[PDB]
Design an enzyme around this catalytic site. Structure first.
Site, PDB file in Angstrom:
ATOM      1  N   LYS A 120     -22.092  74.777 -15.661  1.00 47.06           N
ATOM      2  CA  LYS A 120     -21.858  75.649 -16.806  1.00 47.06           C
ATOM      3  C   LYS A 120     -22.109  77.108 -16.469  1.00 47.06           C
ATOM      4  O   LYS A 120     -21.377  78.009 -16.878  1.00 47.06           O
ATOM      5  CB  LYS A 120     -22.759  75.235 -17.959  1.00 47.06           C
ATOM      6  CG  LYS A 120     -22.599  76.055 -19.233  1.00 47.06           C
ATOM      7  CD  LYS A 120     -23.701  75.669 -20.181  1.00 47.06           C
ATOM      8  CE  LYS A 120     -24.146  76.886 -20.982  1.00 47.06           C
ATOM      9  NZ  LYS A 120     -25.333  76.559 -21.765  1.00 47.06           N
ATOM     10  N   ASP A 138     -21.112  75.112 -24.744  1.00 49.45           N
ATOM     11  CA  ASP A 138     -22.522  74.994 -25.124  1.00 49.45           C
ATOM     12  C   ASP A 138     -22.677  74.337 -26.514  1.00 49.45           C
ATOM     13  O   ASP A 138     -21.683  73.975 -27.134  1.00 49.45           O
ATOM     14  CB  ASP A 138     -23.140  76.404 -25.108  1.00 49.45           C
ATOM     15  CG  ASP A 138     -22.784  77.281 -26.314  1.00 49.45           C
ATOM     16  OD1 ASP A 138     -21.661  77.188 -26.845  1.00 49.45           O
ATOM     17  OD2 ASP A 138     -23.647  78.047 -26.737  1.00 49.45           O
TER      18      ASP A 138
END
Ligand code: SF4
EC number: 4.2.99.18
Length: 211
Positions: A120, A138
Site C-alpha cells: 500500500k 484504505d
C-alpha cells in the site's frame, strides 16, 4: 451502480478539485517516502510538524545518514513509534545510496523491499510522487466505495481489484486522492455529511442522513 453513473461521479470529483493530492508536505520523492514512513499510527498534521523541523536540516539520503539514528530521533520524538521509524529511515537511506544511487526508485518491488514500506505504501508513493495509475485502498476508500456502491467489496483486495476494472484510464491517477479526501471530510464514519455531499444524488447508500 453502472458505467454512466460512475463516470458522472468522477466528473463531479474532478470539477470540485481538478488536481487532488496528499495532505503530507513534500518537495521531492525522498521527502514523500520519509513522510509516508513517518505516517504509521500518526496524523498527517503530526508528521508535517516533525518534517517542518527535520527537512530544513537534512532532506537527502546522505544528510539523513550523517544525522544518524539518534540524530533523527531528536527531530521526530513527537511521533508514535519513532525509535523503530528512525531505524527504518537510516536503513532505507543506506539501501538508496548503495543499490539505487541516492534515488527513490520508480519500481514497486524495489520500494516494497525497503524497510517499513509495504504494498500500500509503495502504491501510494508511485501514485503521489511519480504519477502512476495505482489505487491503494484504505479504510476511508473502502467505506466510500461500499456506501456509494461505486466499487463494493468484502475486503481491501476486492475493492482494489474492482476499482482497477471500473475507473476509466483517464481518471486512474487522481482516483485515490479524490476518494480518500471525500471519505475524510464528507463521507465520514460516524454521521456522513450527506445533506452537503457533492455526489449525494448519485450515491446509492440506503441510510443517508441529513437528507
Ligand atoms: S450521500 Fe452520504 S453516504 Fe453518499 S457519498 Fe455523500 S456523504 Fe457518503
Amino acid at each position: 451502480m453502472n458505467k454512466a453513473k460512475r463516470l458522472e461521479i468522477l466528473t463531479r470529483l474532478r470539477e470540485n478539485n481538478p488536481h487532488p493530492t496528499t495532505e503530507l508536505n513534500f518537495s521531492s520523492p525522498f521527502e514523500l517516502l520519509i513522510a509516508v514512513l513517518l505516517s504509521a499510527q500518526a496524523t498527517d498534521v503530526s508528521v508535517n510538524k516533525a518534517t517542518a523541523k527535520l527537512y530544513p536540516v537534512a532532506n537527502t539520503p546522505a544528510a539523513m545518514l550523517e544525522l544518524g539514528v539518534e540524530g533523527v530521533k531528536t527531530y521526530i520524538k513527537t511521533i508514535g513509534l519513532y525509535n523503530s521509524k528512525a531505524e527504518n529511515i537510516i536503513k532505507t537511506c543506506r539501501i538508496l545510496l548503495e543499490q539505487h544511487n541516492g534515488e527513490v526508485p520508480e519500481d514497486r518491488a524495489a520500494l516494497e523491499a525497503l524497510p517499513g514500506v509495504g504494498r500500500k505504501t509503495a502504491n501510494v508513493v508511485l501514485n503521489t510522487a511519480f504519477g502512476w495509475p495505482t489505487i491503494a485502498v484504505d479504510t476511508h476508500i473502502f467505506r466510500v466505495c461500499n456506501r456509494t456502491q461505486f466499487a463494493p467489496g468484502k475486503n481491501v483486495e476486492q475493492v482494489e481489484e474492482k476499482l482497477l476494472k471500473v475507473v476509466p484510464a483517464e481518471f486512474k491517477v487522481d482516483c485515490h486522492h479524490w476518494l480518500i479526501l471525500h471519505g475524510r471530510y464528507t463521507c465520514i464514519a460516524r454521521k456522513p455529511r450527506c445533506g452537503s455531499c457533492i455526489i449525494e444524488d448519485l450515491c446509492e447508500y440506503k441510510e443517508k442522513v441529513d437528507i
